[PDB]
C-alpha cells in the first residue's frame, strides 16, 4: 500500500496548496439559512443547527462575534482556522460548506453531525472496549498522517473535539489551535490533560505533540479517564512532565506497550517521531487487526452506531439558551478580518 499512500499524499498536497494560496471567500449569506437550535456555546462562540431554506440541508453554523474575537486576542487564530478548513479535505475532518461575514460576525457553515460529541458518548458508557477504541484511534492516525504531510499541527485532540457521524465514524472539529509550520513552534495552547511535556516546558516542539495527544486519547477512551489529571492544570502539568504513568489492570500488554511508546517524554524516541514515522504506529501489534485502507474507505462496520431520528434532530446534544443573532448597521473590525 506504500506506493499508493505516497501517491495519494502527493495529490493531496497539491490540491491543498492551491486552495491554501487562494482561499475561498464569501460563499453564502446569513439569510439563506434558517436558525434552528444552538448545539453548543462557550468562550469559543456558538454553534447553531441551521437549515438552508432552499435545499433543506442541515448544517452546523459556528458564529463568532468580531469584537469578542479581538478582545480575546484570537484574530489570527480565527482567520487561520477558516483558511485551513477551506483548504483541507479528508473523510475524518468535518467539512466547511460555506463561509462569510457581516458587520458584526464571522460565520463558518460546517457539516452537521447528528451523532453528537465523542465526549458525551464516552462519559455515558464509561469506557470503550479496546476494539472500539482502536477503531477511533485508527481514524485519528490516518487524519494526523494527512495533516502532518501538509505541515499542519492540530494541537487540540480530545474527545470534546470529535463527533460521531451517522455511520459511526469520527469527524474532527475545531482548528482554532492548528498551525501550518515546518519545524518547531512554541505557543502554549491546547487542553491541559492533553499537553505534551515539551508544550508545557518553555522549549520548542513539533508535530510530535500530536502523537503524544493520540496516546492520551487512546488511554482515556480505554480507561474512561485520562492518564494525567488533578484538580488544577498546574497539578496536571506536574504529572505530565514527571511523565510517570499507570495503566488500568484491564489494559492488554500490547495496548500498554503502544502507550508507553506514545506517552514518551523523550520526544527522541516517541512513536510517530522516529525514522519510520507513522508506520511505527500503523505496524504496532495493537493495530494488528486494523485494515487501514478499509478504514480510510469507510468500509469497516463501526462498533458503535449513534442513534438518529433525523437530519435536523438534536437529541444527542445538550441544551443551551437561545440568543438572538444581532447584526450591527455599522462595520466592526473590517481591516482586521478583511481576509475572512
Amino acid at each position: 500500500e506504500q506506493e499508493s499512500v505516497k501517491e495519494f499524499l502527493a495529490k493531496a498536497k497539491e490540491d491543498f496548496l492551491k486552495k491554501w494560496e487562494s482561499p475561498a471567500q464569501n460563499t453564502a449569506h446569513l439569510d439563506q439559512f434558517e436558525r434552528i437550535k444552538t448545539l453548543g456555546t462557550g468562550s469559543f462562540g456558538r454553534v447553531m443547527l441551521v437549515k438552508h431554506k432552499e435545499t433543506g440541508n442541515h448544517y452546523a453554523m459556528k458564529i463568532l462575534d468580531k469584537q469578542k474575537v479581538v478582545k480575546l486576542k484570537q484574530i489570527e487564530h480565527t482567520l487561520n482556522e477558516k483558511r485551513i478548513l477551506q483548504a483541507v479535505n479528508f473523510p475524518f475532518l468535518v467539512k466547511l460548506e460555506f463561509s462569510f461575514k457581516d458587520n458584526s460576525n464571522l460565520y463558518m457553515v460546517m457539516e452537521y453531525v447528528p451523532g453528537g460529541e465523542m465526549f458525551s458518548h464516552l462519559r455515558r458508557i464509561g469506557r470503550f472496549s479496546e476494539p472500539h477504541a482502536r477503531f477511533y484511534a485508527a481514524q485519528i492516525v490516518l487524519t494526523f498522517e494527512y495533516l502532518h504531510s501538509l505541515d499542519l499541527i492540530y494541537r487540540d485532540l480530545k474527545p470534546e473535539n470529535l463527533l460521531i457521524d451517522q455511520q459511526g465514524y469520527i469527524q474532527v472539529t475545531d482548528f482554532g489551535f492548528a498551525k501550518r509550520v515546518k519545524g518547531r513552534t512554541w505557543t502554549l495552547c491546547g487542553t491541559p490533560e492533553y499537553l505534551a511535556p515539551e508544550i508545557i516546558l518553555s522549549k520548542g516542539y513539533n508535530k510530535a505533540v500530536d502523537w503524544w495527544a493520540l496516546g492520551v486519547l487512546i488511554y482515556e477512551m480505554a480507561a474512561g479517564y485520562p492518564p494525567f489529571f488533578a484538580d488544577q492544570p498546574i497539578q496536571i502539568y506536574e504529572k505530565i512532565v514527571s511523565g510517570k504513568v499507570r495503566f488500568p489492570s484491564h489494559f492488554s500488554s500490547d495496548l500498554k506497550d503502544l502507550l508507553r511508546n506514545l506517552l514518551q517524554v523523550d520526544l527522541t524516541k516517541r512513536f510517530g517521531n522516529l525514522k519510520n514515522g507513522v508506520n511505527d504506529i500503523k505496524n504496532h501489534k495493537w493495530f494488528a487487526t486494523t485494515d487501514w485502507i478499509a478504514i480510510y474507505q469507510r468500509k469497516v462496520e463501526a462498533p458503535f452506531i449513534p442513534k438518529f431520528k433525523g437530519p435536523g434532530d438534536t437529541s444527542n446534544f445538550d441544551d443551551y439558551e437561545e440568543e438572538e443573532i444581532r447584526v450591527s448597521i455599522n462595520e466592526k473590525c473590517g481591516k482586521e478580518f478583511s481576509e475572512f
Binding site: 487540540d156 470534546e160 495552547c189 487542553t191 491541559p192 474512561g224 479517564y225 489529571f229 484538580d231 488500568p248
Partner: peptide, 19 residues
Amino acid sequence: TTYADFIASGRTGRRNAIH
C-alpha cells in the same frame, strides 16, 4: 481507586482549551 479519584476531581466535564 484511580477511578474514584477521577470522579472527585472536578474535571469530569467538558474541558476548555487554555486561554
